Design a protein around this nucleic acid. Sequence first.
RNA 1: ACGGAGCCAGCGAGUACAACCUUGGCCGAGAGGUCUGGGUAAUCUUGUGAAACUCCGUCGUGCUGGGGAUAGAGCAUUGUAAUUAUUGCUCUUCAACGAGGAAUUCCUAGUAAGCGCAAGUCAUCAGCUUGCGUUGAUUACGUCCCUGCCCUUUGUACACACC
Lengths: 70, 143, 206, 63, 141, 138
Amino acid sequence: AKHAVVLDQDKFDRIMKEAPTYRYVSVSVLVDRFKLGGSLARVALRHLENEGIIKPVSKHSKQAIYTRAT
Amino acid sequence: PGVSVRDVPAQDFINNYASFLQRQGKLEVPGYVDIVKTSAGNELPPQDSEGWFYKRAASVARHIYLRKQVGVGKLNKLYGGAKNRGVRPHKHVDASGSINRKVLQSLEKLGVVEISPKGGRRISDNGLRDLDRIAAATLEDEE
Amino acid sequence: FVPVELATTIPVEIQQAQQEIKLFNKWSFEDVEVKDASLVDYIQISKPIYVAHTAGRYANKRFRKAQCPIVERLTNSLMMNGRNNGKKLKAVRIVKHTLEIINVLTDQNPLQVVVDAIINSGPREDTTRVGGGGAARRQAVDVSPLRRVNQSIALLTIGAREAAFRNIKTIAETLAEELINAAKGSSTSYAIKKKDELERVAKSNR
Amino acid sequence: TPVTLAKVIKVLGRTGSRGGVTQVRVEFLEDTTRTIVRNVKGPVREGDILVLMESEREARRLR
Amino acid sequence: TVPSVQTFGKKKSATAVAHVKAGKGLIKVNGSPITLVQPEILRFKVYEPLLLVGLDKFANIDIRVKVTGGGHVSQVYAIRQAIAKGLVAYHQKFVDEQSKNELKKAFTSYDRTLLIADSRRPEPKKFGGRGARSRFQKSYR
Amino acid sequence: GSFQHILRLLNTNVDGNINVVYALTTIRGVGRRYANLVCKKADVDLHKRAGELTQEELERIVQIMQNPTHYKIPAWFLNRQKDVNDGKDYHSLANNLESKLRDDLERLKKIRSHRGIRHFWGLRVRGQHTKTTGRRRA
RNA sequence: ACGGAGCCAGCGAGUACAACCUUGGCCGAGAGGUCUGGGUAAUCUUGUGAAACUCCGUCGUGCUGGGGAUAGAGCAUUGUAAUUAUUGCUCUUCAACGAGGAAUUCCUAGUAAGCGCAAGUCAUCAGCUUGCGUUGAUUACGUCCCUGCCCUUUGUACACACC
């Protein structure tokens, strides 16, 4: 275990801070920052698709590319 | 027009059929739900848990529509797949018989399946109505 | 222009592509000049094809590997390792996802990044092991023209798959980065380093 | 990295103690009519262009 | 009464038979329309006969196919060869040749078999080895 | 957040975070499909990390672990069955199980059978060929 | 990998004096019990709707949900007989191995390598061999450097012939 998988409310504040205005947004991208490792990043990205925010490109399991809503 | 089952995609057909049954809750439940492996070779139980049977019963109904007469043993062979039998090559063996049989027994009383001659189970007159209504409902969802 | 009416209903977005522009999947296959004498003719953008999964009577005569479009070269190269031998459906799905990444990054036609990557990972000089008694002295022999293209496409996929060996960054993200680094010569990607480290060996024995 | 241009003018059989080398005569695109013999590893055809760092030096049959 | 020619294409064992008619414009595959197919990524391949010559040709011709043999991806070629011939059989009989000749030379530039039947069939596995050419592992120790 | 990490259950360790089933697999007796069967009775999400739980769920589970036939189990998803003379079945899922097997292995050694003789020397019991397998021994 | 959903081949084989292949219907969480057939076989099993694959979800780079070996208890079946686990199944037991040192084998296109299926032996037993069809590359399209084979020209004190 290399940390950054445990659920913290302090991190949930900083997810919404760093959500908007980015080129690359995916499961591949967020894990490079040591955020919610693995599957909890997919759940974090599932929140950001609901109320606009970040809009999709690909819609496959394991290949989930997104881009900011202009 | 030409409203048939084939205009609606096969994977998308079952989604509208599943929600249709859960509103009523009159397709009946056997008793073996979530005390279940699903097949003769399958390590993890159903991930869906709730619903589940309504997905299975919908996919059984649409296959009985296309073909003349489907049985219990063939449905087990169709749904069933691969194994991991220790350190040997992966084989193929039938799925759970008790789940797929009580789909066919329960759907008879609801009003879909009919007893056919020779062997197997064909479609009723009222069974073709509910298949087309949900197909027409799925046509409205797309269009 | 003019969506044609039949009994069967096709979406308009598909018919927008028809008649006017012979596209790839959605975006344009046209333009994309190579601009590097040696790789001209052998790298073929003039052939317009939609899907990268043809029948293929390629490897028969000798120089018929040139006829194959460069999009199909990348699909076949990813099939190595016995787990992934065969299964072009799995590769063809991945090759679409690599091109979607490049479209997002600074707009651009993604084949212009792919073609420039083939130029910047093809060695100029590759030494052949000459005997001359027994020892492994390496004489400086030159490289042209399919050997520059065939090595370059292989070295991209070796660098791509090794980067995604026990990793969240699955093949499509790594392969897209390798082409950007080669197109915009950064001296970081291993498509360039493995080419540059052989340069280099020829000049020592010259 | 001095990039000297080139072009194939004649294929000189299939040389070497082993099978993996092919002799070629090379004429230049820029500064025409300068013929020099030099080896090529891969396939060769009439009308092809060669990329090379070192041009004016001459190669022989590999042993 | 209606014009009916029974065109058929073939890639490996995967065979398909396209029974064309005159009418509105059906291009169905096993009952369902053109937009299913069911490999899903290879839906784009089945359009290639349509999008080259154009949808204007199919406004009169009504095709429907029954595919059997082979696998999943091999059957897409059987459909694509059947639909490609389906136009030519209609345009040869009851239409002027110059339209039908433009179909021929259009498909040559984008020649992914289309009209021509492919050459490759499987070859027998001979004794002593795990395949035709591949032999068993030796040992002389 | 971060409510408790170990977190004992019948003396054995149940590590915090992770999952319902795969944390419960740490117990010397519970496995990858039993804990799902036990979780089905209590009805809890497998989606959660499970180390951070309510206090009632641990005590409800332990009652199901001890008593097999009382709670909703078919009585054929059990570890051990039939012991002593003419009667009943029972199982265990803690340090009880590891201790039980050592006492049950002594029964085979006391009666002194083809298995019990083989268990003395540390050789293969289930009719295997010992001309290859496990070049180390114990 | 673990879930559902989608769902496509070709080679074969098969009892009436025996006990063969065996759909359809009930019993069972499985394996398997039973009532019935049909078939002496492009007629019934059988469309032998077989796998790998396709596509949305669950896990995500931790000997981990990867991997399955050792283990114990019982429920089935074939046998006069299964304790020296025949065979399959049901929960538990949960290791060894983070791409392999010198060496070394096979291979130029529907081939290589994944993938299962059928037959052969068969009362009951494929991790085997002989056959079939799906998925389908990279790389030569040349050479005697290495390991051996054919001729010519040379030398022989060998002719059960350089062991």
